[PDB]
Amino acid sequence: QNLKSTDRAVQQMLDKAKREGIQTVWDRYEAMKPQCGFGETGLCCRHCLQGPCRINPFGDEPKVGICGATAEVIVARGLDRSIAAGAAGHSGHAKHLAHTLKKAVQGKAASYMIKDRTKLHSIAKRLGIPTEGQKDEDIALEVAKAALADFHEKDTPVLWVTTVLPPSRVKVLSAHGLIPAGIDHEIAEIMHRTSMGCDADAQNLLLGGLRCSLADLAGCYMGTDLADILFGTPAPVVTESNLGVLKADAVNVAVHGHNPVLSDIIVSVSKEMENEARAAGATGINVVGICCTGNEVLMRHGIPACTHSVSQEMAMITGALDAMILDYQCIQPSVATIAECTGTTVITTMEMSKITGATHVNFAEEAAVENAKQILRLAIDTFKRRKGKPVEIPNIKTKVVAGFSTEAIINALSKLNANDPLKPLIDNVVNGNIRGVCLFAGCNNVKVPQDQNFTTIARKLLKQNVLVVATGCGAGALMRHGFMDPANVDELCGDGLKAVLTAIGEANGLGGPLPPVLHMGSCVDNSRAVALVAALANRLGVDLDRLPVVASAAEAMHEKAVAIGTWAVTIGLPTHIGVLPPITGSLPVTQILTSSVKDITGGYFIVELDPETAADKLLAAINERRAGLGLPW
């Protein structure tokens, strides 16, 4: 079971599902091989009823789509559509948060409120929204209206793009017409231009896709900002991760998905429902996290991460998972089917995200508490049915220090320098103690043994004094293998990095160093690493395509991840992706994305499937940026 997952709890539960006869994602993957060469290479198109059209990667006819579409065009249209669908997911989540905020500050959802006034003021001022003499509800109402405004055309471009990148980057992007005019506008225009009989030039297509990926960036940044206003800016926390955070003698309730609007209230209501949890023989309600909603409650409240991504079903396999509460995105629909064998109540809540088989509780921000209890009651109900029956929880769990928002990191650096908090980080970059910065992002993928690319690449980079920050299921993969535990700095980190992590730690009231990897939150919280990197650029007066920053979607899978990789390339970063995107059917497009895009944005894609090789190329790019600053490496 090692070619499936490098996670030991996951291997134990895989053995269980094998003997109990429950189909897993790896099983469905095994029944899918050998996969379609056309699909994998991108040479498949079904945008009209004359198709499907396939193009042979190598050989005789068909050399071209029925309508005449070349391989360059088929590949670039497919990729543009994945960028747009990612942008739709991130943007829908942030749009929901903006409606939540407007409802709140107009007295419509008393379960919600402004929990971070500093953040709201810094945002409203980033946007040129007047603060002084204006009351908070009016300020937040303005901020929310602006968020909603960024989804359509208007007098200004998308503010959550133009006001969050260094103006030099904004100028570089505006010269090539890359600035989104509206988030949903860009999504619709992608769907227009990639449909049959429209755009038929690969450069033109890919430029459209770069623009749409900045629309996605805006969705991420909006979601981060709005969720921080609404639920508090993450600050460092200590919790634990892996399946061992589940307890047999408690009501175990998993928050799973991406949108914290629901699950943060779940977290807060669960505490008061203890009185009722006891009357069923439970120590209480044990709220754990799966995927990105889980990372959100782990960043804000120290909620332990139970599992992530490709191994989410393994949670239910323990037999101790009483309630799985979904919102949307990255939920394997198999959980519904699986719940009949493991005894779990699987509950959907968002009306555009139901799974056939599941129970649906219609959540709305206005009646939050009334539904939260309704769900948790059901959770305790299921704990009745499984009282005194054999659970198998692998006793595997790790110590996780997380909650490193960009604000937390700037506060952490301030204790070394109160009026120039970025100065110490810059100094240790300049003298080699930090070789560069690498952001691990994205999901697990069934094609890659779970966490293998993440942990391998992280191992080389840490041993090379690269500051590593991580989000979403990247942060999940690293924390489940010890990389968010300060006690592992010694083994993992090279001497200089060790020194800096130690200096900051001892200077922040601990006598111990920061974790070896900085957990920065969920998928939209990739925006946080932009905020930091932008700040870095600004404090040094250069564009991002000169900083020794890189990014790695080491085991990418979802369309969100493609949009994210593309907007890391678009804001200047060298961007590795550890699974094939479907571009290898076109050398011109591959060449545009790994090279000639260098000439437009300074970023570029690094396609490398071997994790050791990928760490080498990532260090090579970091070191090239060093050499461009005149820096030693």
Residue entry with tokens 């995927």: 291
DSSP H or E stretch at residue 419: none
Per-residue string for binding with its own copies, 358-377, x by CB under 8 A? --------------------
- Contact with ligand SF4 (CB under 6 A): which of 47, 211, 300, 386? 47
H helix intervals, 24-166: 25-30, 37-41, 71-105, 117-126, 136-149, 159-162
User: Shortest distance, CB of residue 221 to Fe ion, whole angstroms?
Assistant: 14
For Fe ion, which stretch binds (CB under 5 A), given 92-100, 102-110, 152-160, 291-299? Answer: 291-299
Contact 164, 526 (CB under 8 A): no
User: Shortest distance, CB of residue 301 to its own copies, whole angstroms?
Assistant: 24
- The count of C-alpha atoms lying within 13 angstroms of the C-alpha of 335, restricted to the half-sphere facing its C-beta, is 31
SS3 353: coil
Identify residue 364 by its one-letter amino acid code: A
Is 579 near its own copies (CB under 8 A)? yes
With respect to Fe ion, which residue has the nearer C-beta, 129 or 475?
Answer: 475
User: Shortest distance, CB of residue 2 to ligand SF4, whole angstroms?
Assistant: 22
* Burial class of 541 by CB neighbour count within 10 A (0 to 12, 13 to 18, 19+): exposed
The rounded distance, in Å, linking the Cα atoms of 144 and 229 is 11
Burial profile 229-261: b = 16 or more Cβ within 10 angstroms, e = fewer: bbbbbbebbebbbbbbbbbbebbbbbbbbbbbb
The rounded distance, in Å, linking the Cα atoms of 562 and 603 is 15
Check the annotation: does 53 bind a ligand. Answer: yes
Check the annotation: does 36 bind a ligand. Answer: yes
Partner whose binding site includes residue 292, from Fe ion, its own copies, ligand SF4, none (CB under 5 to 8 Å by kind): Fe ion
Check the annotation: does 523 bind a ligand. Answer: yes
Contacts of its own copies in 234-273 (CB under 8 A): 257
The rounded distance, in Å, linking the Cα atoms of 570 and 543 is 12
Is 91 near its own copies (CB under 8 A)? yes
Partner whose binding site includes residue 36, from Fe ion, its own copies, ligand SF4, none (CB under 5 to 8 Å by kind): its own copies
Beta bridge partners of 574: 604
Query: What are the structure tokens assigned to 310, written together?
Result: 């490709």
- Contact with ligand SF4 (CB under 6 A): which of 43, 53, 243, 400? 53
Is 330 near ligand SF4 (CB under 6 A)? no
- Contact with ligand SF4 (CB under 6 A): which of 181, 188, 196, 238? 196
For ligand SF4, which stretch binds (CB under 6 A), given 61-69, 120-128, 213-221, 466-474? Answer: 61-69
Size of the site for ligand SF4 (CB under 6 A): 13
* Burial class of 175 by CB neighbour count within 10 A (0 to 12, 13 to 18, 19+): exposed
The rounded distance, in Å, linking the Cα atoms of 184 and 186 is 5
The rounded distance, in Å, linking the Cα atoms of 290 and 323 is 12
Contacts of Fe ion in 323-342 (CB under 5 A): 330
Check the annotation: does 44 bind a ligand. Answer: yes
User: Residue ranges for the binding site for [4Fe-4S] cluster?
Assistant: 36, 44-45, 48, 53, 67
Under the rule (CB under 6 A), what is the footprint of ligand SF4?
45-48, 50-51, 53, 65-67, 69, 74, 196
User: Residue ranges for the binding site for [Ni-4Fe-5S] cluster?
Assistant: 258, 292, 330, 443, 473, 523
